[PDB]
Amino acid sequence: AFNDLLQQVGGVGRFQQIQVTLVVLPLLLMASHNTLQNFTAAIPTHHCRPPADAEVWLPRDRQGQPESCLRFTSPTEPCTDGWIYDNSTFPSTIVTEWDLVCSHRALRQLAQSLYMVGVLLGAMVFGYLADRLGRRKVLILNYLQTAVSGTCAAFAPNFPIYCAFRLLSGMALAGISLNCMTLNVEWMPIHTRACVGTLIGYVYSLGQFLLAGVAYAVPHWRHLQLLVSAPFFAFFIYSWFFIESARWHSSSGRLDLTLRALQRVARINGKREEGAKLSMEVLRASLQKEASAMELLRCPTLRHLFLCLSMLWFATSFAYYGLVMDLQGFGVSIYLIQVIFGAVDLPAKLVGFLVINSLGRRPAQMAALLLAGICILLNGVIPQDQSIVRTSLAVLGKGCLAASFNCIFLYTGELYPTMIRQTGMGMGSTMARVGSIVSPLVSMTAELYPSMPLFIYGAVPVAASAVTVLLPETLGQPLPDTVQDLES
């Protein structure tokens, strides 16, 4: 009877209206910390540096641009000296610092892959530790670790040091991304739980505008990293004023902490008269009524559904985190491309929400996945000469993939049974990062063909679109109470 206690205290009060906002506010930096390898590691035009022995020194070809590989040893040798980088729009990037051009092109993808690997470990470890040490302590440690491991990456003189710092930053960001939702969902009542779930996605979607504005404000990559990682100290400094969740305290076994927290919340809300009436015996009278991960195995009913949902999550995450990167080559400047990409998610979600409830869950998911797959696959045949339909197809695919996540989140949440739902959500979110890790590894194959990664990015959603026809439709149907009554 925790719900009746929340309604007795006041439910949605001033304390919630302060705490949920002060917790969701730092999430605006998700886009800045995630999709940074478009601005901080841009590749400008470059050519070989001639030796200091002196225009006609380079083997220019393909309509006369200088060749960055050969150098005309006689007035056919590798460079091994250095390069001259343009400084008209990119004064300093990663490839400018350590000369990561023409011989070490894959190390950018390697650093991105390491940052993506550093997400699963952080999510697993800190999600395991949060249910043992408490949400507020883990949030405090995350706030500290993010700033400490982010502000030192701008002064890294070597590449592996920067990679390790970015991996630890990805650890901290994965931890905070899980723990913000975990702490925010608990305090809200049963009838307003779904309202705050969509609100956090709105905050995540708004980060691209801030990222574009900050990137336009400072071109220099060290100052960019410092300015992005700076506000985490100011976020950490007031983090000691949060109140621990009463549900975790009650499930732990200590009820005096729940009584003290409820009384304190009554003082903040101004309803201390109900808090005085609230005592120990009513918690022992109303909360008297207050599943392994391997149960998916050796049970075909759960395993058959789990395999398909994991495949869908993997395919959607792979397509999204492959499309969002490599913004260069579109002709339009990346600053405009960022805001145009950020301005497409809202109408796509608006269309998708009505499409789900007007047609069906599975038909909407199939339509979104098939449309995204064919739209990405169409991009691989039209040449470089055009400059409008490429951007149109890219933004349509990005918005449609965002709608695909918006559909599959509610589909996965509603489809699973009640008891196994939490670990199903956790395993689905875990599987939704393997594709993100793999996407730089398959993007590394751009050397062989200039459109093979683009062909790969379109084939997986197309293949997974026809996979969805193997699931029952659960629109306007009761949720499965257990496995015994799960037949349709």
Curated annotation (Swiss-Prot):
PTM comment: Glycosylated. Glycosylation at Asn-87 may occur at a secondary level. Glycosylation is necessary for proper targeting of the transporter to the plasma membrane.
Annotated catalysed reactions: (6R)-L-erythro-5,6,7,8-tetrahydrobiopterin(out) + a dicarboxylate(in) = (6R)-L-erythro-5,6,7,8-tetrahydrobiopterin(in) + a dicarboxylate(out); L-erythro-7,8-dihydrobiopterin(out) + a dicarboxylate(in) = L-erythro-7,8-dihydrobiopterin(in) + a dicarboxylate(out); L-sepiapterin(out) + a dicarboxylate(in) = L-sepiapterin(in) + a dicarboxylate(out); prostaglandin F2alpha(out) + a dicarboxylate(in) = prostaglandin F2alpha(in) + a dicarboxylate(out)
Effect of K398A: Decrease in the level of membrane protein expression and 70 % loss of PAH uptake
Keyword Glycoprotein: yes
Gene Ontology, cellular component aspect: basal plasma membrane; basolateral plasma membrane; caveola; extracellular exosome; plasma membrane; protein-containing complex
GO MF annotations in UniProt: alpha-ketoglutarate transmembrane transporter activity; antiporter activity; chloride ion binding; identical protein binding; organic anion transmembrane transporter activity; prostaglandin transmembrane transporter activity; sodium-independent organic anion transmembrane transporter activity; solute:inorganic anion antiporter activity
Domain of life, per lineage: Eukaryota
Extracellular side, ranges: 30-109, 162-164, 220-222, 326-335, 384-392, 443-451
GO terms for biological process, alphabetical: alpha-ketoglutarate transport; metanephric proximal tubule development; monoatomic anion transport; organic anion transport; prostaglandin transport; renal tubular secretion; sodium-independent organic anion transport
Annotated positions for site Important for interaction with cidofovir: Y204
Glycosylation site list: N38, N87
Primary localisation category: membrane
Xref: InterPro entries: MFS_dom (IPR020846), MFS_sugar_transport-like (IPR005828), MFS_trans_sf (IPR036259), Orgcat_transp/SVOP (IPR004749)
Expression sites by tissue: Strongly expressed in kidney. Expressed at lower level in liver, skeletal muscle, brain and placenta. In kidney, found at the basolateral membrane of the proximal tubule. In testis, primarily localized to the basal membrane of Sertoli cells and weakly expressed in Leydig cells and vascular endothelial cells.
Transmembrane segments: 9-29, 110-130, 139-161, 165-187, 199-219, 223-243, 305-325, 336-356, 363-383, 393-413, 423-442, 452-472
Chain positions of site Important for interaction with cidofovir and PAH: F405
Membrane topology: Multi-pass membrane protein
UniProt keywords, alphabetically: Cell membrane, Glycoprotein, Membrane, Transmembrane, Transmembrane helix
Domain notes: Multiple cysteine residues are necessary for proper targeting to the plasma membrane.
Family of the protein in this entry: Belongs to the major facilitator (TC 2.A.1) superfamily. Organic cation transporter (TC 2.A.1.19) family.
Record function comment: Secondary active transporter that functions as a Na(+)-independent organic anion (OA)/dicarboxylate antiporter where the uptake of one molecule of OA into the cell is coupled with an efflux of one molecule of intracellular dicarboxylate such as 2-oxoglutarate or glutarate. Mediates the uptake of OA across the basolateral side of proximal tubule epithelial cells, thereby contributing to the renal elimination of endogenous OA from the systemic circulation into the urine.
Note: Involved in the renal transport of a variety of drugs with well-known nephrotoxic potential, therefore may play a role in the etiology of the drug-associated nephrotoxicity. Uptakes the diagnostic agent PAH/para-aminohippurate and clinically used drugs. Mediates the pH- and chloride-dependent bidirectional transport of PAH/para-aminohippurate in exchange for 2-oxoglutarate or glutarate as counteranions. Can also mediate PAH/cGMP exchange.
NCBIfam families: 2A0119
Protein name: Solute carrier family 22 member 6
Organism the protein comes from: Homo sapiens (Human)
